Motif scaffolding. Structure first.
Motif, PDB file in Angstrom:
ATOM      1  N   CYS A 147       0.828  -1.188   0.000  1.00 46.70           N
ATOM      2  CA  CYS A 147       0.000   0.000   0.000  1.00 46.70           C
ATOM      3  C   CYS A 147       0.879   1.260   0.000  1.00 46.70           C
ATOM      4  CB  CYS A 147      -0.909   0.017   1.202  1.00 46.70           C
ATOM      5  SG  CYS A 147      -2.047   1.408   1.231  1.00 46.70           S
ATOM      6  N   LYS A 148       0.647   2.116  -0.954  1.00 44.31           N
ATOM      7  CA  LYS A 148       1.225   3.425  -1.092  1.00 44.31           C
ATOM      8  C   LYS A 148       0.153   4.460  -0.753  1.00 44.31           C
ATOM      9  CE  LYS A 148       3.109   6.680  -4.498  1.00 44.31           C
ATOM     10  NZ  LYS A 148       4.196   7.329  -3.770  1.00 44.31           N
ATOM     11  N   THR A 149       0.426   5.367   0.168  1.00 47.25           N
ATOM     12  CA  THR A 149      -0.518   6.405   0.474  1.00 47.25           C
ATOM     13  C   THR A 149      -0.060   7.716  -0.159  1.00 47.25           C
ATOM     14  OG1 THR A 149       0.471   6.921   2.639  1.00 47.25           O
ATOM     15  CG2 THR A 149      -1.275   5.312   2.576  1.00 47.25           C
ATOM     16  N   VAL A 150      -1.041   8.514  -0.543  1.00 49.84           N
ATOM     17  CA  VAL A 150      -0.795   9.823  -1.124  1.00 49.84           C
ATOM     18  C   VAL A 150      -1.676  10.851  -0.407  1.00 49.84           C
ATOM     19  CG1 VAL A 150      -1.014  11.300  -3.165  1.00 49.84           C
ATOM     20  CG2 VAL A 150      -0.214   8.913  -3.437  1.00 49.84           C
ATOM     21  N   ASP A 151      -1.007  11.828   0.202  1.00 53.39           N
ATOM     22  CA  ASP A 151      -1.598  12.996   0.845  1.00 53.39           C
ATOM     23  C   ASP A 151      -2.038  14.009  -0.194  1.00 53.39           C
ATOM     24  OD1 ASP A 151      -2.166  15.225   2.419  1.00 53.39           O
ATOM     25  OD2 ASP A 151      -0.217  15.269   3.455  1.00 53.39           O
ATOM     26  N   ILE A 152      -3.338  14.258  -0.316  1.00 53.64           N
ATOM     27  CA  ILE A 152      -3.784  15.211  -1.329  1.00 53.64           C
ATOM     28  C   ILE A 152      -3.923  16.650  -0.819  1.00 53.64           C
ATOM     29  CG2 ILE A 152      -4.993  13.429  -2.548  1.00 53.64           C
ATOM     30  CD1 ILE A 152      -7.541  15.682  -1.721  1.00 53.64           C
ATOM     31  N   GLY A 153      -3.639  16.871   0.452  1.00 57.83           N
ATOM     32  CA  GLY A 153      -3.845  18.157   1.086  1.00 57.83           C
ATOM     33  C   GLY A 153      -5.246  18.312   1.625  1.00 57.83           C
ATOM     34  N   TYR A 179     -15.300  14.055  -0.994  1.00 60.11           N
ATOM     35  CA  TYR A 179     -15.193  14.001  -2.464  1.00 60.11           C
ATOM     36  C   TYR A 179     -13.820  14.515  -2.884  1.00 60.11           C
ATOM     37  CZ  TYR A 179     -20.071  13.131  -1.729  1.00 60.11           C
ATOM     38  OH  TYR A 179     -21.248  12.615  -1.225  1.00 60.11           O
ATOM     39  N   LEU A 180     -12.773  13.759  -2.538  1.00 60.17           N
ATOM     40  CA  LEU A 180     -11.396  14.233  -2.760  1.00 60.17           C
ATOM     41  C   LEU A 180     -11.113  14.593  -4.202  1.00 60.17           C
ATOM     42  CD1 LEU A 180      -9.405  11.731  -0.543  1.00 60.17           C
ATOM     43  CD2 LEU A 180     -10.721  13.778   0.163  1.00 60.17           C
ATOM     44  N   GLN A 181     -11.813  13.924  -5.112  1.00 59.06           N
ATOM     45  CA  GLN A 181     -11.640  14.214  -6.515  1.00 59.06           C
ATOM     46  C   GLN A 181     -11.994  15.648  -6.902  1.00 59.06           C
ATOM     47  OE1 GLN A 181     -13.767  12.010  -5.064  1.00 59.06           O
ATOM     48  NE2 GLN A 181     -13.677  10.026  -6.078  1.00 59.06           N
ATOM     49  N   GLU A 182     -12.794  16.299  -6.097  1.00 61.20           N
ATOM     50  CA  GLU A 182     -13.180  17.689  -6.410  1.00 61.20           C
ATOM     51  C   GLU A 182     -12.189  18.662  -5.812  1.00 61.20           C
ATOM     52  OE1 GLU A 182     -14.976  18.391  -8.715  1.00 61.20           O
ATOM     53  OE2 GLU A 182     -16.700  17.054  -8.866  1.00 61.20           O
ATOM     54  N   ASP A 183     -11.383  18.258  -4.840  1.00 57.31           N
ATOM     55  CA  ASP A 183     -10.387  19.142  -4.264  1.00 57.31           C
ATOM     56  C   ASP A 183      -9.031  19.007  -4.964  1.00 57.31           C
ATOM     57  OD1 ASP A 183     -11.469  20.850  -2.204  1.00 57.31           O
ATOM     58  OD2 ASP A 183     -12.084  18.944  -1.231  1.00 57.31           O
ATOM     59  N   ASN A 184      -8.592  17.823  -5.347  1.00 57.00           N
ATOM     60  CA  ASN A 184      -7.307  17.686  -5.981  1.00 57.00           C
ATOM     61  C   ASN A 184      -7.294  16.593  -7.046  1.00 57.00           C
ATOM     62  OD1 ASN A 184      -4.591  17.855  -6.653  1.00 57.00           O
ATOM     63  ND2 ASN A 184      -3.902  17.698  -4.532  1.00 57.00           N
ATOM     64  N   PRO A 185      -8.069  16.802  -8.130  1.00 55.93           N
ATOM     65  CA  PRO A 185      -8.109  15.782  -9.179  1.00 55.93           C
ATOM     66  C   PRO A 185      -6.781  15.592  -9.889  1.00 55.93           C
ATOM     67  CG  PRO A 185      -9.159  17.823  -9.910  1.00 55.93           C
ATOM     68  CD  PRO A 185      -8.903  17.945  -8.423  1.00 55.93           C
ATOM     69  N   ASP A 186      -5.959  16.669 -10.037  1.00 53.67           N
ATOM     70  CA  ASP A 186      -4.741  16.488 -10.816  1.00 53.67           C
ATOM     71  C   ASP A 186      -3.741  15.596 -10.100  1.00 53.67           C
ATOM     72  OD1 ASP A 186      -5.496  17.779 -13.245  1.00 53.67           O
ATOM     73  OD2 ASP A 186      -4.873  19.733 -12.379  1.00 53.67           O
ATOM     74  N   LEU A 187      -3.604  15.708  -8.754  1.00 54.47           N
ATOM     75  CA  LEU A 187      -2.663  14.841  -8.080  1.00 54.47           C
ATOM     76  C   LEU A 187      -3.211  13.388  -8.079  1.00 54.47           C
ATOM     77  CD1 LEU A 187       0.006  14.550  -6.480  1.00 54.47           C
ATOM     78  CD2 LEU A 187      -1.364  14.944  -4.464  1.00 54.47           C
ATOM     79  N   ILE A 188      -4.525  13.229  -7.886  1.00 52.49           N
ATOM     80  CA  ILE A 188      -5.086  11.875  -7.936  1.00 52.49           C
ATOM     81  C   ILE A 188      -4.825  11.262  -9.283  1.00 52.49           C
ATOM     82  CG2 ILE A 188      -7.205  10.558  -7.779  1.00 52.49           C
ATOM     83  CD1 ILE A 188      -8.140  12.753  -5.689  1.00 52.49           C
ATOM     84  N   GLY A 189      -5.177  11.959 -10.381  1.00 50.08           N
ATOM     85  CA  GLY A 189      -4.964  11.407 -11.688  1.00 50.08           C
ATOM     86  C   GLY A 189      -3.516  11.145 -12.019  1.00 50.08           C
ATOM     87  N   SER A 190      -2.647  12.121 -11.719  1.00 50.13           N
ATOM     88  CA  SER A 190      -1.231  11.926 -12.065  1.00 50.13           C
ATOM     89  C   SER A 190      -0.603  10.790 -11.271  1.00 50.13           C
ATOM     90  CB  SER A 190      -0.485  13.227 -11.923  1.00 50.13           C
ATOM     91  OG  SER A 190      -0.403  13.618 -10.581  1.00 50.13           O
ATOM     92  N   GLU A 191      -0.971  10.624  -9.998  1.00 49.19           N
ATOM     93  CA  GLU A 191      -0.408   9.538  -9.202  1.00 49.19           C
ATOM     94  C   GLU A 191      -0.968   8.193  -9.640  1.00 49.19           C
ATOM     95  OE1 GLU A 191       2.151  11.042  -5.801  1.00 49.19           O
ATOM     96  OE2 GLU A 191       1.869   9.264  -7.005  1.00 49.19           O
ATOM     97  N   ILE A 192      -2.254   8.107  -9.998  1.00 53.62           N
ATOM     98  CA  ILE A 192      -2.736   6.855 -10.586  1.00 53.62           C
ATOM     99  C   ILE A 192      -1.970   6.524 -11.861  1.00 53.62           C
ATOM    100  CG2 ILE A 192      -4.674   5.691 -11.673  1.00 53.62           C
ATOM    101  CD1 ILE A 192      -6.480   7.319  -9.728  1.00 53.62           C
TER     102      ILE A 192
END
Ligand SMILES: [Cl-]
Length: 293
Positions: free
Chosen positions: A259-265, A270-283
Motif C-alpha cells: 500500500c502506497k498512500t498519497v496525501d492530497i492536502g 469528495y477528494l476528486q473535487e479538491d485535488n483531481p490532478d494529483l489523484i490522476g497523475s499519481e494513478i
C-alpha cells in the motif's frame, strides 16, 4: 478545475436497463474501471480520467439509477447495485482490471475484488467504506445528519423531498466551493424528486453501529480479504477527511499490504473535487508496474 464533461456517451443493456459509461483509451491492455458513489456519477472522475487515458483504457459507469443510466423503480439496495455492476462488467467482456474506487463504488469494487481476486491487478481507493462499528467512530460534524438520513420519515423528507444529499452533503464535503455549473451536472439526474430513491437507500445501507447486518458482514469480509491480499494498493487521503481521517490513513499504510498512500492536502469526502490532478497523475504513474504477471 474543469467543469465540463467531454466524454461521448456509451450504453449497454444490462438486466433490462441501460447503463451509461465513459469508455476512452486503447483497447488492447488492462482497463481501469472507475466506480463512483453517492450522490455522484462518472462526472466525479472527469478531471482524473484525462491523466490515465493516454496510457490505459478508462471505463467509468454510472451506477444504476444514477448519472445517465436508466432509472428502474428499484429499492436500490446495495445488492441491486451489485447485480447491475456485475452484469455491466461481464457485458463489456472485462477480464483483468485495475480498480479506481470511492464510497459506495469502493464497497462495490472491494466486494467484486474479493469474489474475483485473480482479475484485479491493483486498487486505487479513497474515502472508502469499511465498518464504522459505533456512532462515535462516525465524524462528529456529520453524525446527527446521517442519523437523520437513516430514518423512514425524516431521512426521506430531507433526501428525497428536499434533495439534501445533492444540495447539502455533497458541497459540504468538498473543501473548495463547487460552482453552479458543477452543481447542475450533479443535479441533473435527480431533477425529479421521486428519482432520488438511491440517494436515500445508500446512507441507510452504510455499515454503521452494526446496522444493516448484511452490509456489515459483507464489508467485514472484503476488508478481511483486503488486509491479507498482496494486490497493489494506492490510497489517497485528505485532511481532515471524512471516512478515512489522516491517522487512519497512516494506520492503513501499515496494515494493508503493498500500500502506497498519497496525501492530497485539504479534503473531506469528495477528494476528486479538491485535488483531481494529483489523484490522476499519481494513478497514471502507478499503473505501469502493475502490468507484469
Ligand atoms: Cl451514503
Amino acid at each position: 478545475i474543469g467543469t465540463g464533461f467531454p466524454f461521448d456517451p456509451h450504453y449497454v443493456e444490462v438486466l433490462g436497463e441501460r447503463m451509461h459509461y465513459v469508455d476512452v483509451g486503447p483497447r488492447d491492455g488492462t482497463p481501469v474501471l472507475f466506480l463512483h458513489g453517492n450522490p455522484t456519477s462518472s462526472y466525479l472522475w472527469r478531471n482524473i480520467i484525462p491523466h490515465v487515458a493516454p496510457s490505459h483504457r478508462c471505463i467509468a459507469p454510472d451506477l444504476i439509477g444514477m448519472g445517465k443510466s436508466d432509472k428502474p423503480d428499484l429499492d436500490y439496495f446495495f445488492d441491486d447495485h451489485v447485480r447491475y455492476l456485475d452484469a455491466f462488467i461481464e457485458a463489456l467482456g472485462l477480464e483483468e482490471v485495475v480498480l479506481v474506487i470511492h464510497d459506495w463504488g469502493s464497497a462495490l469494487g472491494f466486494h467484486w475484488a474479493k469474489r474475483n481476486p485473480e482479475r484485479v491487478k491493483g486498487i486505487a481507493c479513497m474515502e472508502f467504506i469499511r465498518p464504522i462499528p459505533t456512532w462515535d467512530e462516525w465524524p462528529e460534524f456529520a453524525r446527527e445528519t446521517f442519523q437523520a438520513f437513516r430514518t423512514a420519515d425524516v431521512g426521506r423528507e430531507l433526501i428525497i423531498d428536499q434533495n439534501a444529499f445533492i444540495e447539502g452533503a455533497l458541497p459540504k464535503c468538498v473543501v473548495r466551493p463547487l460552482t453552479e455549473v458543477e452543481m447542475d451536472h450533479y443535479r441533473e439526474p435527480f431533477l425529479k424528486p421521486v428519482d432520488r430513491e438511491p440517494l436515500w437507500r445508500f446512507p441507510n445501507e452504510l455499515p454503521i453501529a452494526g446496522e444493516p447486518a448484511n452490509i456489515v458482514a459483507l464489508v467485514e469480509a472484503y476488508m478481511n480479504w483486503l488486509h491479507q491480499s498482496p494486490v497493489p494498493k494506492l490510497l489517497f487521503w485528505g485532511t481532515p477527511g471524512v471516512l478515512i481521517p489522516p491517522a487512519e490513513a497512516a494506520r492503513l499504510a501499515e496494515s494493508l499490504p503493498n500500500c502506497k498512500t498519497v496525501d492530497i492536502g485539504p479534503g473531506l469526502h469528495y477528494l476528486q473535487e479538491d485535488n483531481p490532478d494529483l489523484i490522476g497523475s499519481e494513478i497514471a504513474r502507478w499503473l505501469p508496474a502493475l502490468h507484469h504477471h
